[PDB]
Amino acid sequence: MIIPVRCFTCGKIVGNKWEAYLGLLQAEYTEGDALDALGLKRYCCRRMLLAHVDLIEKLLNYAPL
Amino acid sequence: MNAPPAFESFLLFEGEKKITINKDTKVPNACLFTINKEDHTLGNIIKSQLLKDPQVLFAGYKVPHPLEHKIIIRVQTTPDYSPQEAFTNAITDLISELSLLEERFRVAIKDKQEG
Amino acid sequence: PYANQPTVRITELTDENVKFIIENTDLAVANSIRRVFIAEVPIIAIDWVQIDANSSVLHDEFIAHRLGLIPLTSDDIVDKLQYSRDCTCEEFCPECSVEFTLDVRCNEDQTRHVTSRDLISNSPRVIPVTSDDILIVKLRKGQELRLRAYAKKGFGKEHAKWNPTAGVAFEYDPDNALRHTVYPKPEEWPKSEYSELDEDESQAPYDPNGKPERFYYNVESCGSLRPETIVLSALSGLKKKLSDLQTQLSHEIQ
Amino acid sequence: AGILFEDIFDVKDIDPEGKKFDRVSRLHCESESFKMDLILDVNIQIYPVDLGDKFRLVIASTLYEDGTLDDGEYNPTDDRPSRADQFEYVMYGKVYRIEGDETSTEAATRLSAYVSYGGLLMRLQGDANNLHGFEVDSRVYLLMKKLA
Ligand SMILES: [Zn+2]
Numbered sequence: 001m002i003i004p005v006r007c008f009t010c011g012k013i014v015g016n017k018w019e020a021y022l023g024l025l026q027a028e029y030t031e032g033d034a035l036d037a038l039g040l041k042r043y044c045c046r047r048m049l050l051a052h053v054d055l056i057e058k059l060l061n062y063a064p065l
Numbered sequence: 066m067n068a069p070p071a072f073e074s075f076l077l078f079e080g081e082k083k084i085t086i087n088k089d090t091k092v093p094n095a096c097l098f099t100i101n102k103e104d105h106t107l108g109n110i111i112k113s114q115l116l117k118d119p120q121v122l123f124a125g126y127k128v129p130h131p132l133e134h135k136i137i138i139r140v141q142t143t144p145d146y147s148p149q150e151a152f153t154n155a156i157t158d159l160i161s162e163l164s165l166l167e168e169r170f171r172v173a174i175k176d177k178q179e180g
Numbered sequence: 181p182y183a184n185q186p187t188v189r190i191t192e193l194t195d196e197n198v199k200f201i202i203e204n205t206d207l208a209v210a211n212s213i214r215r216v217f218i219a220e221v222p223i224i225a226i227d228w229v230q231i232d233a234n235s236s237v238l239h240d241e242f243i244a245h246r247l248g249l250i251p252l253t254s255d256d257i258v259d260k261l262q263y264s265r266d267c268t269c270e271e272f273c274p275e276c277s278v279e280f281t282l283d284v285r286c287n288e289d290q291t292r293h294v295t296s297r298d299l300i301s302n303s304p305r306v307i308p309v310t311s312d313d314i315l316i317v318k319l320r321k322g323q324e325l326r327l328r329a330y331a332k333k334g335f336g337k338e339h340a341k342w343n344p345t346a347g348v349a350f351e352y353d354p355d356n357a358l359r360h361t362v363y364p365k366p367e368e369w370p371k372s373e374y375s376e377l378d379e380d381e382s383q384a385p386y387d388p389n390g391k392p393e394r395f396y397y398n399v400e401s402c403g404s405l406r407p408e409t410i411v412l413s414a415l416s417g418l419k420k421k422l423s424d425l426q427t428q429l430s431h432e433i434q
Numbered sequence: 435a436g437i438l439f440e441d442i443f444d445v446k447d448i449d450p451e452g453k454k455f456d457r458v459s460r461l462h463c464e465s466e467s468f469k470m471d472l473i474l475d476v477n478i479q480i481y482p483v484d485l486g487d488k489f490r491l492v493i494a495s496t497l498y499e500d501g502t503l504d505d506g507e508y509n510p511t512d513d514r515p516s517r518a519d520q521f522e523y524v525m526y527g528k529v530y531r532i533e534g535d536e537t538s539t540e541a542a543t544r545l546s547a548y549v550s551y552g553g554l555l556m557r558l559q560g561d562a563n564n565l566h567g568f569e570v571d572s573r574v575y576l577l578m579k580k581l582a
C-alpha cells in the first residue's frame with residue numbers, strides 16, 4: 001500500500017528511503033547498488049524496499065470524496 | 066478479543082505479590098521463589114549467578130507457561146546456608162557487577178570519543 | 181561465590197551503532213544485557229492519537245499505527261519523564277507526555293507528501309529523528325489530514341515501537357572452540373568477522389575447559405537514542421530491576 | 435578397601451567397526467597381568483585415548499577409600515578423601531548382567547560382567563576368580579588413569 005515505517009524483522013527505519021530508492025533507480029543504479037547506497041545491509045531490510053509495491057499511487061487517481 | 070492487554074507482562078495488578086517464598090519439603094534446605102511479572106531476563110541471570118556459589122547444591126528456574134508471567138526458581142544449598150541468603154547474595158553480586166560494568170562502559174565511551 | 185570483573189573494549193562508535201566487546205562475564209548476563217537492549221530501554225513514541233479530520237486514502241487506524249512507529253529523539257528527556265499511568269496528572273501533562281500536532285491540507289494539483297517534517301511538537305527536545313524524512317501518507321488535491329497526538333514513555337516489552345534498537349548483533353566463541361554448535365562439515369562455513377583463524381583452518385581446536393566469554397556486541401540504534409545511551413540506559417534499567425527485586429525479597433523475608 | 439577389581443590394560447582397537455558416535459569410542463583392551471578382555475565406551479572428547487595406550491583400571495564399590503557407602507547422590511561439596519584424585523577418568527555405573535560359561539553341573543570358570551555408565555557400556559570378560567566382587571544391580575565406579 002505505502003512503504004512501512006519499520007522493517008518488520010529488525011525494526012530499522014525504512015520509511016524515509018522509498019523516494020530516494022526510486023530516485024536512485026532513475027539514476028540507472030542496479031537495485032543492489034541502490035540498496036547499498038541507502039545503507040541496507042541485512043537482507044531483512046533489503047527485502048522491504050526490494051519487494052515493496054507502492055499501491056497508494058494507484059489509489060490517488062480516484063477523486064477524494 | 067481474548068488478546069490480553071500488553072501491559073499485563075510487567076505490571077502487578079492489585080493484590081499480587083512480586084515475589085513469594087515457599088519451603089520445599091521434598092529435600093532439606095530447598096526453597097521455591099515464585100516471581101510474578103518476570104521472564105527469562107531475570108530468571109536466567111539469577112540462576113547463572115547462583116550456580117557460581119559453591120554452597121549452592123542446586124539452582125534452576127522455569128517459566129511454567131509462556132503466556133503466564135511467573136518464573137519459579139528452585140534453590141537448594143548446603144545445610145549451613147539458607148537458600149534465601151544465597152538468593153540475596155546472588156542479587157547483590159549481580160548489582161555490583163552491573164554497576165562496575167556501567168562505570169567501565171562510561172570510561173570506554175569517553176576514551177573512544179576522545180580518541 | 182561472587183561477581184565477575186567484566187571488562188569493556190569499544191571497537192567502534194558512530195551515531196548509528198556502537199560495536200564493543202564484554203569479557204569476563206557469564207553467558208546469561210551477556211544475553212540478559214542483549215535482551216534488555218531490545219525490551220527494557222524506555223524511549224518516547226506516539227501512543228495517543230486523536231484524528232480531528234482525515235480524508236486520505238488510508239483509514240484512521242492506518243495513520244495512527246504509522247505514527248506510532250515514528251522514532252522520536254528521546255536522548256535525555258526520557259529519564260526525567262514518568263510513565264503516564266504512574267503520573268498523577270489529569271491524563272496528560274508535560275511531565276508524562278509530549279504533545280504533537282499535524283495539520284496538512286493538500287490544496288494543490290501535485291501529490292503532497294505528508295512526512296515526519298509535518299509533525300510539530302510542543303517540546304523542542306523531542307522531534308522526529310529525521311528532523312530524507314519518514315513518509316506518513318500521500319495526499320491528493322482536496323484531501324486534509326488533521327490530528328493531534330501525544331507521545332509517552334515506554335519500553336519495547338510493551339510494544340515494538342518503544343524498541344530503540346534496529347538490530348542487536350550478538351556473538352561469542354566465533355571459532356567454535358567450545359563446540360556449542362557442531363558443524364557437520366566445518367569447511368563449508370564462512371569465518372565470523374571476529375575469527376582469529378587462518379584460512380587453512382575451519383574451526384578452533386576443542387577446549388574441554390572452555391567457558392563462554394568475550395561476547396561481541398554491535399548495537400544499532402533506530403535513532404531515538406544514541407547507541408551509547410542505549411547501552412547505558414539498559415545497564416541502569418537492569419540494575420534497577422534487580423534492586424527492586426532485592427527490596428521486595430527483603431520485605432518478603434522479613 | 436572396597437576395590438572390586440584392579441588391573442592395567444593396553445588398547446588393541448579404538449573402534450573396530452568404525453565409529454558410530456562422534457564423542458564416544460569403543461575401546462577394546464587387553465590385560466597383561468591376567469587374561470581379561472575389556473570392551474569399554476569412553477567419551478573420547480574430554481579424555482582422548484590413542485591406540486596402544488596403557489592405563490590402570492580400577493572398578494570400585496565406593497570412592498571414599500574407607501568402605502563408607504556412597505549414597506548414589508551427587509554431592510559436589512563432599513569433603514572426604516576420594517580415590518578419584520588419584521585418577522584422570524572416573525565414571526559411575528551399574529552392573530546389569532553377569533554371563534558365564536557355567537554348565538548345568540559346574541560353576542563358571544570364565545565370567546563376563548556388563549556395566550552401564552549412564553549408557554556407556556563396558557564388558558569385562560575373564561577368569562571368574564577376578565570377578566567375584568561383581569554382583570548384578572550393584573552401583574560401581576570405573577576409575578582410569580593412563581600410564582606412561
Ligand atoms: Zn530490517
Ligand SMILES: [Zn+2]
Pocket residue numbers: 264267268269270271272273274275276277
Ligand atoms: Zn502526566
